[PDB]
């Protein structure tokens, strides 16, 4: 059978699903004293449950549309990954059960690049297409490695360049970098490192973090941050991988810092806590272009613990949202409790889930509506939808082109990626609410020419959550007239000494490389300003 | 899989080896149902490592000292240096366990860190211990991720520091970096990057490569190398991942470069080719601690396709050695000594020794299973493991707490991260005068047990730079500032890149590579060359 907690529904064609319904697994690192029992998943993820719902909603919406996959039913087998490779693989082994009892023709998921890579290695083997709604690592664009992998989220390459463009914009040359020690944080900071050095930005420190980092490991990173004159900190990490570090920085009230948030934690409920505002206030981050899902918000509200014969996560959702089953009536209202399930402004990753399901639906439709000699298969033959195999769906998904329910053109490139713009958000505090509000202060247009991609409105930004002045984050303060830039041995190029000009020489303008000799008739003034 | 090395036993040890260097590099049309991909370049060294697992298993079996009561059986598969082929095989090892959604109690392998990580994710799930003889990535030290992973090869962390120590030694400040775009090359160069920056070494370029890189992808890297003033190139890659790049550099006869070889390619048959010597000559690389396995070289010669019934790779080995079929045909009367392949053409057993050591680690862990009596145990209430009903997780707790004495009388133990420390030998790529083949001369050593700064030993006299010159090459961004001049900033370029600005009148510079010029005392004035001061002004 496979895992106990699941969202299952029978159909003619089955779509697998992988969602982080829980943030992690139990802190039980067994001594292996006895036979190891299955680990239990711990922190409930309401946002993750909302994404699971977007898959079901889309599946039901397709099932109701008679012209899309006519006289056919889309079924599903959705599992909880708990943001862990092991739990995800347990589930993936169930999807591939038949391949070496209904077949899984395609899989939606996973979230974390580390989890999606592990799933892709196993699915790729059986040519089952995988459509991830959130895994953005550049490593997943390698089609020699990931033969059946596609995604409805852009690759992080431009996001890391956008970081370096923002730094170049506000004219900062002294930054620090923090990355989650996974297939997401590591390639993201590496691309950023490359782009910052192109734009002559010096990186003072480059540290690694994880959700399972020691008190010792966290201490070292906090010390590195404190012992650094760099105020700009670039962070390529997820919420769970960053939470241990942020908790400690909040505890020590380290307030100077101006955080540059990667898309994974820029909208994380684990970091966007009002208690952390003294530390995380005025964070500049990335958000994906938001999409529209009409009727979805209504569908979310219809969730009932008893009703969901199909959704086995509906009981646990009810229990966590109402500190329930104390006991539940079942007649409880979901508008009353404030959880990220309904407490959202824009559907971004949820939209990517919706878009992922529709990509598979449209790929299956192209097989179905195929005309004798216009097929993608041998001699121009068409596949039989009644006898459809996963590899056939993959062939179609590879260079799929379809029109969005918003009327927009959706296409996957040669690396199975979607290209998308980014919205730039700033972490403000709502005066009335008291909660962290994500104000859209700019955008990053990836279609624009290099140097014309970034748009920022400085006026909408609240530095450190309060300040209205762009902070200083250069290694050394600029050399004034009468002085020249001097090298500091062991320190990088944008760390300089301001050496006073020698007698007979002058420094007319600010940040001079050397002083100019006065013409033979004249001599330097009292402080070498000019002669 | 069809092609395997199987033998029944009481306890089965899984095996993963790169019998082939890669798979048919082709985009599946997907016009037709995808068939099993074809593995392509035969790996004789890989086959010799597979043999070290069988030899060790047979040596344990014959010997009464170890498990006289039990027979060690095996199920060995070819990975073809690919995640997919390795996972196909791993799915077979876990076949019995998988039913919850013939037991394999432990697995030997794989080689590539990318392959071992994929295998580890699947094995770790079922707590089947995995002992890799060659996967050296630091990423595999993470015990939250890799619960059942252990290795008989050290972690690359000190190897990358050793690179930076060698560069610091020869006083070079301008280098380039090349890494295989995998879980091996990437963390190795990243650690090197940290260490080089701590020793004030500037990296001009940082490029990525792969065995499946485009003609365009390779061309970009060769252009980057050519357009760079850096002569020292640090390469963290395997032979297969580096071969496409080296082939092109040889084709363009780019000879200036001085290569710093990662342990994976420092002894690679694919790179250590005599037609590449103009390019790869005088390469400074790393080799692990060697080992001798008595009777192994005679065991290697005993291979026949009809006789070796258990080894299904013998047929293909035979065919690729004598260039025959089982285009001319093979005779069961062919002699092994006649054909010269890397199977017998080896000098030291290093990775082969790690395979031998990996099998013995599992053997000694199982041996500690019988010797157990209630009280001497680690389980339940001091409980022990029933060697007749042994489960893989039981072998794993024993392997974690494993301490045993080696074939060379050395203590073998695993870290809390399943690692084992080891020193490195530093080799140099020389040419045999008579033979014309690439000889690996041991020019130094790296002692990991020594204090920081005292770990490296090198004999410059034994090194032949570029394969010929005895002069340590220049590889700094800018030539040193002589007396009379001071160091000046270059706005775009890093700190290693400086201008040598002439001292002003009334000032001088006593020393080479000065930050600023010193003012002469009032009685004196600047020298003709600004190197000192002369009296009367
Ligand atoms: N992009 C991240 C994961 C991620 C992106 N956005 C998110 C929002 C919430 C949770 C996780 C994410 C990765 O591929 O690893
Ligand atoms: N250490 C490399 C593989 C490797 C080391 N030595 C080798 C010799 C031959 C072939 C491969 C190797 C890795 O972890 O990926
Ligand atoms: C439509 O579906 C029903 C139920 O699955 C089936 O009985 C009928 O034969 C199908 N029609 C076609 C055209 O296949
Ligand atoms: C910081 O450095 C950049 C580049 O050197 C420069 O343009 C900027 O003006 C400096 N910052 C200040 C404080 O002026
Ligand atoms: C944190 O520091 C800031 C500035 O020093 C200050 O405004 C704030 O009140 C401090 N927080 C606490 C815990 O008082
Ligand atoms: C990206 O933004 C630009 C301008 O803001 C727009 O022209 C483009 O349509 C947007 N992205 C997409 C999905 O095309
Ligand atoms: C090169 O490298 C360092 C500077 O970082 C220095 O010790 C050495 O003397 C330099 N000079 C030359 C010409 O090698
Ligand atoms: Ca329908
Ligand atoms: Ca997930
Ligand atoms: Ca620069
Ligand atoms: Ca979150
Ligand atoms: Ca330095
Ligand atoms: Ca025996
Ligand atoms: Ca291998
Ligand atoms: Ca090799």
Author numbering:
A (entry chain A): 20 to 119, 135 to 359, 393 to 598
B (entry chain B): 22 to 122, 136 to 360, 392 to 602
What does the paper say about this structure?
The extracellular calcium-sensing receptor (CaSR) is responsible for the maintenance of a stable blood Ca2+ level. CaSR is a class C G-protein-coupled receptor (GPCR). Ligand binding to CaSR takes place within a large extracellular Venus Flytrap (VFT) module that consists of two domains (LB1 and LB2). In addition, CaSR contains a cysteine-rich (CR) domain that connects the VFT module to the transmembrane region.
In the form II crystal structure, both protomers of CaSR ECD have the closed conformation associated with agonist binding (closed-closed). Surprisingly, the ligand-binding cleft of each protomer is solely occupied by an L-Trp molecule. Ca2+ is bound at four novel sites in the CaSR ECD structure, including one at the homodimer interface. Each CaSR ECD molecule also contains two PO43- ions. L-Trp facilitates extracellular domain closure of CaSR by contacting both LB1 and LB2 domains of the VFT module. The interactions between CaSR ECD and L-Trp are primarily mediated by hydrogen bonds. Third, the CR domains of the two subunits interact to form a large homodimer interface that is unique to the active state. Finally, the structural reorganization of CR domains reduces the distance between the C-termini of the two subunits from 83 Å to 23 Å. Our structural data indicate that the Ca2+ ion at site 4 stabilizes the active conformation of the receptor by facilitating homodimer interactions between the membrane-proximal LB2 and CR domains.
